[PDB]
DNA sequence: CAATGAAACGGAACAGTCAG
DNA sequence: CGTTTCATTGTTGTTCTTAGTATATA
DNA sequence: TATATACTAAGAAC
């Protein structure tokens, strides 16, 4: 494909109360799993293809901001070249204390609609 | 009157240039729930119209102020103000201004009479 | 990776036509 | 007629240069 | 003890 073009991967996690504290057992957590996956892939992409684009955007949240001021959508970090200033932002949420921060800053997880999630991403 | 907000508006010109399409999409999403179909046989009282009629109208309290830069003010038989704008385009979407902060016919007349309709009357230094 | 170019559009004004 | 948008040409990564430090050899 | 000979490892140039 066109060389000057670049790969772009956007990240989008269910922010409802569904998997925020599912934790059937005490050995994993889907949010602690999804955020771990995002952090790992994003740090790998740092070194691998630093020219590319990544973005993380949560849906179903209670606080709101996006390009179109919709409901229950949070664009955590926009599409831009990867960098540490966002490694830290993602890392801020890794942890039980971190999930406490996430819930009391954006929300428990309200109602949502993946139509509007696809529209906004 | 002092302390009160305007209730009757006089159309001046049509503008459709100066905004990036992302800004236009944002403004359309913002205003979508306020547009009402325009009836020539039943026009709104807050918005009088000249010969030019819009396809849809919006009540002034729900609208947005736009900053317009145009070459000059020229006579027109299509707008009630007796005049329109030559080469008009939107410079900024004035989200920092309220709807009632729109100028008045007195301001329009002052601008028209300042330089014989020309809106450029200041030297470059 | 972007400055430079176009092309595409947005009215502005005119008149002839058609309806009525 | 003016404004805006898009697409394309300049863009570079690599090789070589010098460096620096390395040591043993005479 | 002196001398250079070797190397790698830098660099920047294009």
From Swiss-Prot, chain A:
Subcellular location(s) of the protein: Nucleus; Chromosome; Cytoplasm
Outcome of mutating residue 2 to A: Diminishes the ability to form a Schiff base. Abolishes adduct formation
Phosphoserine carried by residues: 22
Taxonomy, superkingdom: Eukaryota
PTM field: Phosphorylation by PRKDC may enhance helicase activity. Phosphorylation of Ser-22 does not affect DNA repair. ADP-ribosylated by PARP3.
Active-site annotation: 2 (schiff-base intermediate with dna)
N6-acetyllysine: residues bearing it: 2
Induction per the UniProt record: In osteoblasts, by FGF2.
Subunit field text: Forms a heterodimer with XRCC5/Ku80; heterodimerization stabilizes XRCC5 protein. Component of the core long-range non-homologous end joining (NHEJ) complex (also named DNA-PK complex) composed of PRKDC, LIG4, XRCC4, XRCC6/Ku70, XRCC5/Ku86 and NHEJ1/XLF. Additional component of the NHEJ complex includes PAXX. Following autophosphorylation, PRKDC dissociates from DNA, leading to formation of the short-range NHEJ complex, composed of LIG4, XRCC4, XRCC6/Ku70, XRCC5/Ku86 and NHEJ1/XLF. (Microbial infection) Interacts with human T-cell leukemia virus 1/HTLV-1 protein HBZ.
Function: Single-stranded DNA-dependent ATP-dependent helicase that plays a key role in DNA non-homologous end joining (NHEJ) by recruiting DNA-PK to DNA. Required for double-strand break repair and V(D)J recombination. Also has a role in chromosome translocation. Has a role in chromosome translocation. The DNA helicase II complex binds preferentially to fork-like ends of double-stranded DNA in a cell cycle-dependent manner. It works in the 3'-5' direction.
Note: Individuals with systemic lupus erythematosus (SLE) and related disorders produce extremely large amounts of autoantibodies to XRCC5 and XRCC6. Existence of a major autoantigenic epitope or epitopes on the C-terminal 190 amino acids of XRCC6 containing the leucine repeat. The majority of autoantibodies to XRCC6 in most sera from patients with SLE seem to be reactive with this region.
Family: Belongs to the ku70 family.
Name the record gives this protein: X-ray repair cross-complementing protein 6
Species, as recorded: Homo sapiens
Lineage: Eukaryota, Metazoa, Chordata, Craniata, Vertebrata
Curated annotation (Swiss-Prot), chain B:
Family from the record: Belongs to the ATP-dependent DNA ligase family.
Subcellular localization, as worded in the UniProt entry: Nucleus
Summary of the tissues where the protein is detected: Testis, thymus, prostate and heart.
Span list, region Required for catalytic activity: 119-125
Subunit structure: Interacts with XRCC4; the LIG4-XRCC4 subcomplex has a 1:2 stoichiometry and XRCC4 is required for LIG4 stability. Component of the core long-range non-homologous end joining (NHEJ) complex (also named DNA-PK complex) composed of PRKDC, LIG4, XRCC4, XRCC6/Ku70, XRCC5/Ku86 and NHEJ1/XLF. Additional component of the NHEJ complex includes PAXX. Following autophosphorylation, PRKDC dissociates from DNA, leading to formation of the short-range NHEJ complex, composed of LIG4, XRCC4, XRCC6/Ku70, XRCC5/Ku86 and NHEJ1/XLF. Interacts with DCLRE1C; the interaction is direct. Interacts with APLF.
Protein name listed in UniProt: DNA ligase 4
Pathology noted in the entry: LIG4 syndrome: Characterized by immunodeficiency and developmental and growth delay. Patients display unusual facial features, microcephaly, growth and/or developmental delay, pancytopenia, and various skin abnormalities.
Endpoints of the signal sequence: none
Known function: DNA ligase involved in DNA non-homologous end joining (NHEJ); required for double-strand break (DSB) repair and V(D)J recombination. Catalyzes the NHEJ ligation step of the broken DNA during DSB repair by resealing the DNA breaks after the gap filling is completed. Joins single-strand breaks in a double-stranded polydeoxynucleotide in an ATP-dependent reaction. LIG4 is mechanistically flexible: it can ligate nicks as well as compatible DNA overhangs alone, while in the presence of XRCC4, it can ligate ends with 2-nucleotides (nt) microhomology and 1-nt gaps.
């Amino acid at each position: 494909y066109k060389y000057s073009g670049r790969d772009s991967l956007i990240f989008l996690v269910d922010a409802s109360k569904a998997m925020f504290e599912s934790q059937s057992e005490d050995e994993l957590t889907p949010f602690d799993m999804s955020i771990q996956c995002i952090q790992s892939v994003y740090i790998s992409k740092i070194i691998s293809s630093d020219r590319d684009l990544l973005a993380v955007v949560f849906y179903g949240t209670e606080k709101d901001k996006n390009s179109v001021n919709f409901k229950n959508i949070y664009v955590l970090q926009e599409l831009d070249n990867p960098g540490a200033k966002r490694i830290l932002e993602l890392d801020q949420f890794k942890g039980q204390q971190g999930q406490k921060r996430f819930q009391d800053m954006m929300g428990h997880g309200s109602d949502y609609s993946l139509s509007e999630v696809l529209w906004v991403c | 009157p002092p302390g009160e907000k305007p209730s009757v508006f006089h159309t001046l010109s049509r503008v459709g240039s100066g905004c990036t399409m992302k800004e236009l999409y944002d403004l359309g999403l913002k205003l979508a729930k306020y547009w009402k179909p325009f009836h020539r046989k039943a026009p709104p009282s807050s918005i009088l119209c000249g010969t030019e009629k819009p396809e849809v109208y919006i009540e002034p309290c729900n609208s947005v102020i736009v900053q317009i830069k145009a070459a000059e003010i020229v006579p027109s038989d299509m707008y009630k103000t007796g005049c329109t704008l030559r080469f008009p385009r939107i410079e900024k979407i004035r989200d920092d201004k309220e709807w009632h902060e729109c100028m008045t016919l007195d301001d329009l007349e002052q601008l028209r009479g300042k330089a014989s309709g020309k809106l450029a009357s200041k030297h470059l230094y």
